[PDB]
Ligand binder design. Structure first.
Ligand SMILES: O=P(O)(O)CN(CC(O)O)C[C@@H](O)[C@@H](O)[C@H](O)[C@H](O)COP(=O)(O)O
Ligand SMILES: O=P(O)(O)CN(CC(O)O)C[C@@H](O)[C@@H](O)[C@H](O)[C@H](O)COP(=O)(O)O
Ligand SMILES: O=P(O)(O)CN(CC(O)O)C[C@@H](O)[C@@H](O)[C@H](O)[C@H](O)COP(=O)(O)O
Ligand SMILES: O=P(O)(O)CN(CC(O)O)C[C@@H](O)[C@@H](O)[C@H](O)[C@H](O)COP(=O)(O)O
Lengths: 254, 255, 254, 255
């Protein structure tokens, strides 16, 4: 079934996670043909500034995600930044996420694959679509069986990313493809382009969408510009399901 | 508003080729009554890479051929101009005058097209940012153009490659009707396998029309033989984009 | 010998041309091993805004350039925008310049080549280095014998140009190569990068440099940001001649 | 100031290979007394595209090999780290700790390197704008680094291609010493014919040093066999850049 990965960018507090998890739980009940995965980062390990918000740590984060899965029965996903984090994170995360800048770090990918969990690799802004074939191979070699590749934009000049939708059908040759609707419009972002491009993604054909959502984006401690207002999530999901229903008839074979 | 489908063979290989494609476009126009069809073909490929490549049979022959299509099928006509003097003679048959992508900044060419009283469609240069088309529209309005179109046809992405930044559709819609060129946006300065998926994206995002080069036998074309859509596939593609447009339409943002 | 093409961007008046021509004449006398070519456009035919300065026309322009060549004995170069302009311009211009956006317009190139004059094609911001081979072929087919290709930057994301210096040795395979030092840093520009990149061009190896210079750039009616202050021209020329003298020992064969 | 030349085989194929290159670098250091040489080699290629490609013989073996080079030739040493825990063991032999291009934004790795008290050289990510290296330097200073270098190694330009925007040299010089990577800046994500011309450009523009991978027999290298410079060509290249630097130096702008 179609995958919808959503949640607040960073674990600002398990308090915030529970509220978002409550809404995502409601949607999962409303859209039974959609597999929802709750997402949130326990650490923003690659912020540009040393003075920016990173988070409350791996322990506090895993703890919070635990509360979400136990209280709502929702699958979990979060990203790791160094090999040692794979095992402890795998205790809760159903899908281990590999950051875009780290999509070529062999040991990180192998550590994720060794946990037995599913692995979702964010395609680096420097990577060509066809070069993700080797990324998948590393994971398979490492024992991974459920593998995802996430489109999140490509470097286009300075401080700008472009989404080359040709990447969707290309990557589909070796893995399930997820479209990251929030970071793809981010400027190394205009919220005005989030919905339009999500529509494009489902019209082209993908296996799921990734969206950062927050009750009050403006008050968010991270991505206050691109995080989707929680209340708008239902409408966007219904919209992409309707577009997918009609467009899927034309999705090219493999 | 009626969706625009601009289609036809890339080059006017012969008046016969035109009538063959015109016949099919006329048939589709009868079926897809919610679509406004415009027959397109270039009387001259004035910017081919090689001096040895096919250019055409001249303006006189081309305009005469286009006039036959219009007379025989009652179809609207569009073709591109390359120098200012061509605007007047072309305006006699063309309902929409097309401005080539490399020439989207040539003031006199734009002015020449605008004073004819015909609609003008400017292909966005591969070097132009979406927001910089605002001045292109300003020039046309200044020159008398009342019906203006901007066509997305890809942007330079490294060497010999174009990428389609779909954010350009809503940006350009702020000042003109927007057309998506489904065949030139995938050509390597020609991966036909991406034509259909990208056109689906264009209509899902939202545009006012699509531009497609089509030929009875692409493999035998004298230009863009790798990107022209086989004529027999046109009907299916149009049906598909009309279906996607309809279901996505309620979500199109207001400019 | 090394080529130095310089002059004010636009023919603001033959008055301005004479002053610049006077300085360029002085430099040509000082640097005998350098072939100076006086440059100025009679029309800015591709301005972004319809309300921008274009010039005084082809007639007034050719007239002014005439005064420069007659009063200083300097070679002349200016750009054409439509085929009919080649003949009248060829009456004065020793080298006919083809604008970057028009480097693929077959008839414009043929019209220039038919005049018997030398032709300098500005490499389009959309063109790959190796694709200039066909540009040269068109000109040769048209009767041109003295052909130049000018590097002026390549599209890099939006509103930015990057200079890929690998283009110099690549283009040298089929034509003499000129480096445009003023437009290459322009943003579809920071004057701070003009000199540094000119140094790079001569260290890599080229057949000449193109520089827009004006007595009072700030008061210029065009490119008031990138036009080099007339008084700084001598210093830059001496600098590139010294760098060339030493670096030329290492220029790769053809 | 003394020009920095960082050179050595891309990967520590064997301690023997290291000593062979070390011998030549030591010889050149005796000739080019105005240059500060730093011997470089990676104990691990932690980001190869294929799982089947050569990675190395482990940190322990690599550090031991590098230590032999330092002991035998008295050469400064630099190698790259991939995870925070490697900073400490590496700092025991490395005078300069290198941060890989893809990892230039990984805060903990940068902090781990900075607290060792060693110099730190960060390869500018192919995704990073020149002005965004200012925060990279800030992180290192925050972490205790007193000697910081930024290395230009190209920027993503379309797919499988890198371009060197030389404007980055003067921009980055505003906050750190700048090094130009002559071998990785031309590799297609490997046109050896552009290595020399681009290094000439770097020194003419002005930088504080150059980085060059060199191997006795590049064709037999286990990594970057297409971009590593034959060791016999190193002397000539260094002489050439010293000559160009000298003549261009009086024109270097003040930051
Ligand atoms: O690795 P990616 O950038 O795709 C992933 N994501 C996580 C996710 O998928 O939610 C991490 C991003 O939040 C992170 O890279 C940010 O974009 C980065 O911190 C940029 O922030 P800034 O420091 O303010 O410039
Ligand atoms: O100006 P554009 O390139 O968008 C327009 N079109 C016309 C159209 O819209 O059908 C002209 C193209 O046919 C033309 O530029 C070709 O793509 C170009 O000649 C490519 O052919 P080639 O010489 O083989 O490199
Ligand atoms: O064709 P090119 O752009 O290289 C040439 N040059 C002439 C020259 O070589 O001096 C023309 C330029 O002056 C012209 O294209 C300008 O860069 C263009 O007018 C940009 O100006 P603007 O309208 O202010 O955005
Ligand atoms: O981090 P960077 O890529 O600049 C650094 N360097 C180290 C150095 O400076 O010698 C690592 C490179 O060797 C490494 O990224 C290679 O270029 C990369 O593994 C290319 O090899 P391949 O697996 O065949 O695609």
């Amino acid at each position: 079934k179609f995958l919808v990965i959503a949640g607040p960018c960073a674990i600002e507090s398990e308090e915030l996670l529970l509220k978002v998890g409550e809404e995502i739980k409601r949607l999962s009940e409303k859209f039974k043909e959609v597999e929802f995965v709750f997402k949130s980062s326990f650490d923003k390990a690659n912020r540009s500034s040393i003075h920016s918000f990173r988070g409350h740590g791996l322990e506090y984060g895993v703890k919070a995600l635990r509360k979400v899965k136990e209280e709502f029965g929702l699958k979990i996903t979060t990203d790791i930044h160094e090999s040692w984090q794979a095992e402890p994170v795998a205790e809760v995360a159903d899908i281990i996420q590999i950051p875009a800048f780290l999509c070529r770090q062999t040991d990180l990918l192998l550590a994720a694959a060794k946990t037995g969990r599913a692995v979702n690799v964010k395609k680096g802004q420097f990577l060509a679509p066809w070069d993700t074939k080797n990324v998948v191979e590393k994971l398979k070699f490492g024992g991974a069986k459920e593998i995802y590749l996430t489109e999140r934009g490509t470097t286009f000049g300075y401080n700008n990313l472009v989404v080359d939708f040709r990447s969707l059908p290309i990557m589909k040759q070796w893995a399930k493809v997820i479209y990251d609707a929030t970071h793809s419009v981010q400027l190394p972002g205009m919220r005005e382009f989030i919905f339009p491009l999500i529509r494009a993604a489902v019209a082209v054909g993908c296996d799921g969408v990734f969206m950062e959502t927050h009750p009050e984006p403006e008050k968010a401690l991270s991505d206050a510009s691109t995080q989707l207002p929680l209340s708008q999530l239902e409408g966007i999901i219904e919209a992409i399901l309707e577009i997918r229903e009609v467009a899927s008839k034309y999705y090219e074979t493999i």
